[PDB]
Design an enzyme around this catalytic site. Structure first.
Site, PDB file in Angstrom:
ATOM      1  CD1 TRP A   1      25.083  21.476 -13.203  1.00 13.97           C
ATOM      2  CD2 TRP A   1      24.965  19.792 -11.735  1.00 13.97           C
ATOM      3  NE1 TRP A   1      23.870  21.555 -12.571  1.00 13.97           N
ATOM      4  CE2 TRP A   1      23.769  20.535 -11.664  1.00 13.97           C
ATOM      5  CE3 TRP A   1      25.116  18.679 -10.899  1.00 13.97           C
ATOM      6  CZ2 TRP A   1      22.728  20.204 -10.791  1.00 13.97           C
ATOM      7  CZ3 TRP A   1      24.076  18.348 -10.026  1.00 13.97           C
ATOM      8  CH2 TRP A   1      22.900  19.111  -9.983  1.00 13.97           C
TER       9      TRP A   1
ATOM     10  CG  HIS B   1      14.991  24.556  -8.336  1.00 16.64           C
ATOM     11  ND1 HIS B   1      14.026  23.915  -7.590  1.00 16.64           N
ATOM     12  CD2 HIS B   1      16.107  23.799  -8.232  1.00 16.64           C
ATOM     13  CE1 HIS B   1      14.536  22.825  -7.050  1.00 16.64           C
ATOM     14  NE2 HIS B   1      15.798  22.732  -7.423  1.00 16.64           N
TER      15      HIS B   1
ATOM     16  CG  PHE C   1      18.666  18.384 -18.956  1.00 17.64           C
ATOM     17  CD1 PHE C   1      19.373  19.571 -19.097  1.00 17.64           C
ATOM     18  CD2 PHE C   1      18.513  17.848 -17.678  1.00 17.64           C
ATOM     19  CE1 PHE C   1      19.918  20.205 -17.982  1.00 17.64           C
ATOM     20  CE2 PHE C   1      19.056  18.477 -16.568  1.00 17.64           C
ATOM     21  CZ  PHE C   1      19.759  19.655 -16.722  1.00 17.64           C
TER      22      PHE C   1
ATOM     23  CG  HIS D   1      14.496  16.345  -2.914  1.00 20.92           C
ATOM     24  ND1 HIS D   1      14.787  15.550  -4.003  1.00 20.92           N
ATOM     25  CD2 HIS D   1      13.602  17.265  -3.351  1.00 20.92           C
ATOM     26  CE1 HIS D   1      14.102  15.971  -5.052  1.00 20.92           C
ATOM     27  NE2 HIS D   1      13.376  17.010  -4.683  1.00 20.92           N
TER      28      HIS D   1
HETATM   29  N1  LIG Z   1      23.236  18.717 -18.487  1.00 25.26           N
HETATM   30  C1  LIG Z   1      22.551  17.785 -17.828  1.00 25.26           C
HETATM   31  N2  LIG Z   1      21.867  16.848 -18.498  1.00 25.26           N
HETATM   32  C2  LIG Z   1      21.145  15.945 -17.858  1.00 25.26           C
HETATM   33  N3  LIG Z   1      21.064  15.930 -16.539  1.00 25.26           N
HETATM   34  C3  LIG Z   1      21.720  16.839 -15.806  1.00 25.26           C
HETATM   35  C4  LIG Z   1      22.496  17.800 -16.441  1.00 25.26           C
HETATM   36  N4  LIG Z   1      23.022  18.573 -15.497  1.00 25.26           N
HETATM   37  C5  LIG Z   1      22.594  18.131 -14.317  1.00 25.26           C
HETATM   38  N5  LIG Z   1      21.795  17.082 -14.502  1.00 25.26           N
HETATM   39  C6  LIG Z   1      21.037  16.371 -13.450  1.00 25.26           C
HETATM   40  O1  LIG Z   1      19.932  17.181 -13.025  1.00 25.26           O
HETATM   41  C7  LIG Z   1      19.511  16.630 -11.766  1.00 25.26           C
HETATM   42  C8  LIG Z   1      19.113  17.799 -10.862  1.00 25.26           C
HETATM   43  S1  LIG Z   1      19.227  17.446  -9.071  1.00 25.26           S
HETATM   44  C9  LIG Z   1      17.676  16.539  -8.718  1.00 25.26           C
HETATM   45  C10 LIG Z   1      16.862  16.160  -9.954  1.00 25.26           C
HETATM   46  C11 LIG Z   1      15.970  14.958  -9.633  1.00 25.26           C
HETATM   47  N6  LIG Z   1      14.741  15.036 -10.436  1.00 25.26           N
HETATM   48  C12 LIG Z   1      15.630  14.966  -8.140  1.00 25.26           C
HETATM   49  O2  LIG Z   1      14.961  15.930  -7.711  1.00 25.26           O
HETATM   50  O3  LIG Z   1      16.051  14.015  -7.446  1.00 25.26           O
HETATM   51  C13 LIG Z   1      20.697  15.828 -11.222  1.00 25.26           C
HETATM   52  O4  LIG Z   1      20.428  14.429 -11.350  1.00 25.26           O
HETATM   53  C14 LIG Z   1      21.836  16.237 -12.156  1.00 25.26           C
HETATM   54  O5  LIG Z   1      22.763  15.155 -12.291  1.00 25.26           O
HETATM   55  O1  LIG Z   2      16.379  20.801  -1.675  1.00 27.72           O
HETATM   56  C1  LIG Z   2      16.238  20.578  -2.898  1.00 27.72           C
HETATM   57  O2  LIG Z   2      15.185  20.152  -3.421  1.00 27.72           O
HETATM   58  C2  LIG Z   2      17.430  20.816  -3.827  1.00 27.72           C
HETATM   59  C3  LIG Z   2      17.287  20.561  -5.187  1.00 27.72           C
HETATM   60  C4  LIG Z   2      18.372  20.717  -6.043  1.00 27.72           C
HETATM   61  O3  LIG Z   2      18.231  20.450  -7.372  1.00 27.72           O
HETATM   62  C5  LIG Z   2      19.598  21.132  -5.532  1.00 27.72           C
HETATM   63  C6  LIG Z   2      20.692  21.283  -6.375  1.00 27.72           C
HETATM   64  C7  LIG Z   2      21.916  21.683  -5.850  1.00 27.72           C
HETATM   65  C8  LIG Z   2      22.059  21.936  -4.490  1.00 27.72           C
HETATM   66  C9  LIG Z   2      20.964  21.789  -3.646  1.00 27.72           C
HETATM   67  C10 LIG Z   2      19.739  21.388  -4.170  1.00 27.72           C
HETATM   68  C11 LIG Z   2      18.654  21.232  -3.314  1.00 27.72           C
HETATM   69  O4  LIG Z   2      18.816  21.478  -1.986  1.00 27.72           O
END
Ligand SMILES: Nc1ncnc2c1ncn2[C@@H]1O[C@H](CSCC[C@H](N)C(=O)O)[C@@H](O)[C@H]1O
Ligand SMILES: O=C(O)c1cc(O)c2ccccc2c1O
Ligand SMILES: Nc1ncnc2c1ncn2[C@@H]1O[C@H](CSCC[C@H](N)C(=O)O)[C@@H](O)[C@H]1O
Ligand SMILES: O=C(O)c1cc(O)c2ccccc2c1O
Lengths: 328, 328
Positions: free
Chosen positions: A129, A242, A224, A149
């Site tokens: 991050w 996860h 968050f 995804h």
């Molecule tokens: N400390 C933090 N506070 C808020 N959001 C965060 C965070 N650290 C990471 N994130 C966000 O957590 C998300 C996880 S990756 C995917 C999450 C999204 N619901 C999806 O599946 O498309 C990313 O958008 C990342 O930017």
């Molecule tokens: O496949 C997914 O759903 C998925 C979800 C995640 O939040 C990930 C975060 C970092 C790197 C890979 C990720 C990822 O592959």
């Protein structure tokens, strides 16, 4: 698998060769007309001679075909390597995307397995991050991959749950606003808020402005780990838990619990251990990237327990699950 | 010849997971008696829970077997992961051996196929040889590994060529003298001298002393880029030329030509690009490590030409070839 030579099963040359082809977009240059090493090389900007050796190995794998005067052609397989393919895999393999770069963090797997810590940092000297937070283009690519995804996994998720009944949902960590978007576009009368970091939040907002959802779609930049926009009907944790270790995950969960109070629900949408999209490989990726882990319905409950929540439902969606938790 | 999914083809998690199992000697601890993650991890110095996750993935791959309660056992394949197995693979995968560590250099492949330069330096900030030169234990492992390839590839090479006829052979880059040893232990009136760097030369010398070959066998420390022990009957270049680029190769070749003269015979003994063991994966490895190259009988001939030599024979013995060159 495992029917292939142990040395083959452990081979790195091939998976690395495939990833390099994806990064040079070789499959695209072949379909686009450049069919010989000299051309594909100058087209991709590679060492002409070295590039040939790569291709040869890849024709052997079964991704390309070569003949006569060394004219290369995609095979029924190599086709999946071009950017304009349905699957859209090249982007995940490309070494410039967040994932394509991060997966190379696997070379430091040994570290993770010896200390239970992420390996990504050992390779890039920083957290994932932190890296995305200081590289807008990199962070942009991650938003794109996660957006992709949503399709591969959350097919028809809008229907599989009673969203409307929530009134207003906070997508905690719902970066780039694809899920909330697909949720509101499918349930008018429903409003929401995407909460994420500057990067994703900025893209979520841009998204809602164009899909004409700014009226029901709100964005809020923040962690968050701190208080969340309180009082919503629902708080979604989609593909977030996860990504974190246990301690962090309960922290994240408590924030949702608090903001939700005795009136809302905390919906974690993830690939719980068992789903057709949850493998031991994903778990390893989760460990190598942030020391996270795929969890079972059971393990999530243990966490919800420590946050003052309780699993009340689990409806399996397309390839993942919707675990619903309320306060206890 | 690889129908399995593109994503699986480019997979890194598995290859790395196997190599980590090798390095942690997981298979050895299992057969020895530690059948539980907690046990095997304490016996390996790994992080209990992280390892459990690795094993679970390797069980899925088909190398191990787990019963309820986390007990593990080796599959018929898992056997090969043992350090005493016939094949002797574990050490080539071990991240501590010169090869098991050098292969991780594949992670920087993109650089090589992009510039034509070696990739090993990119990841270890130095050349392979420089590395082995400053790390005697590393160099030691390389010596044993190459020693292993002698048995795997040169099986019966003793008779495949008329050695005794050369009278005295200089094994240029002879390593720990395994080859020369085999040749002399088969031709009583044949003498020879191993030429290599300190590391290998002293291991070669130690060998000749323990096998009573010190009478007909001697070692000489030196770079095959400088004059060689002159006037020998034959000069052997075993698994050397493909470790070098073309210019360096003709260099090494000129030295042999010079040393041999109009009366000697230079014998390149390595898997020609042609057949058997030699493959694109080997060629990629050679590029990744030193910008080396696996060559064809033609490519070798072209090089020999530049060194005033001329291919005159190529007896394919076992899985490699011995091409005999003399002064033109
Ligand atoms: N400390 C933090 N506070 C808020 N959001 C965060 C965070 N650290 C990471 N994130 C966000 O957590 C998300 C996880 S990756 C995917 C999450 C999204 N619901 C999806 O599946 O498309 C990313 O958008 C990342 O930017
Ligand atoms: O496949 C997914 O759903 C998925 C979800 C995640 O939040 C990930 C975060 C970092 C790197 C890979 C990720 C990822 O592959
Ligand atoms: N400049 C140099 N002079 C002499 N030997 C060298 C060298 N550079 C590398 N080597 C040796 O070349 C060998 C290549 S690998 C082993 C080759 C051996 N004939 C096995 O003859 O089949 C290694 O032992 C390496 O240490
Ligand atoms: O298999 C072989 O014969 C062989 C020979 C070599 O000289 C190598 C040098 C560095 C790394 C691997 C090597 C290797 O695998």
């Amino acid at each position: 698998a495992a029917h292939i030579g142990l040395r083959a099963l452990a081979d790195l040359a091939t998976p690395m060769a495939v990833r390099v082809a994806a990064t040079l977009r070789v499959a695209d240059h072949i379909a686009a007309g450049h069919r010989t090493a000299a051309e594909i090389a100058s087209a991709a900007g590679a060492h002409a001679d070295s590039l040939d050796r790569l291709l040869r190995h890849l024709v052997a794998v079964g991704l390309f075909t070569r003949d006569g005067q060394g004219v290369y052609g995609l095979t029924e397989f190599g086709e999946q390597l071009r950017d304009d393919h349905a699957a859209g895999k090249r982007k995940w393999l490309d070494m410039n995307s967040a994932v394509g770069r991060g997966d190379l963090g696997f070379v430091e797997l040994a570290h993770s397995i010896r200390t239970g810590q992420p390996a990504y940092p050992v390779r890039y000297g920083t957290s994932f991050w932190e890296d995305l937070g200081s590289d807008p283009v990199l962070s942009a690519s991650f938003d794109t991959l996660m957006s992709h995804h949503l399709e591969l996994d959350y097919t028809g998720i809008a229907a599989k749950y009673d969203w409307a009944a929530l009134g207003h949902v906070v997508d905690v960590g719902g970066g780039s606003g694809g899920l909330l978007s697909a949720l509101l576009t499918a349930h008018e009368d429903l409003s929401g808020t995407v909460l994420d970091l500057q990067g994703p939040a900025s893209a979520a907002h841009r998204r809602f402005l164009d899909t004409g959802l700014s009226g029901r779609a709100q964005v809020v930049v923040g962690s968050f780990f701190d208080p969340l926009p309180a009082g919503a009907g629902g708080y979604v944790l989609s593909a977030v838990l996860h990504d974190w270790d246990d301690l962090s995950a309960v922290a994240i969960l408590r924030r949702c619990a608090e903001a939700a109070g005795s009136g809302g629900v905390v919906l974690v949408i993830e690939a719980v251990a068992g789903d057709e999209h949850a493998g031991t490989g994903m778990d390893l990726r989760m460990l190598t990237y942030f020391g996270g882990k795929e969890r079972s319905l059971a393990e999530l409950g243990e966490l919800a327990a420590q946050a003052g929540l309780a699993v009340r439902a689990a409806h399996p969606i397309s390839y993942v699950s919707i675990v619903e938790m309320t306060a206890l």
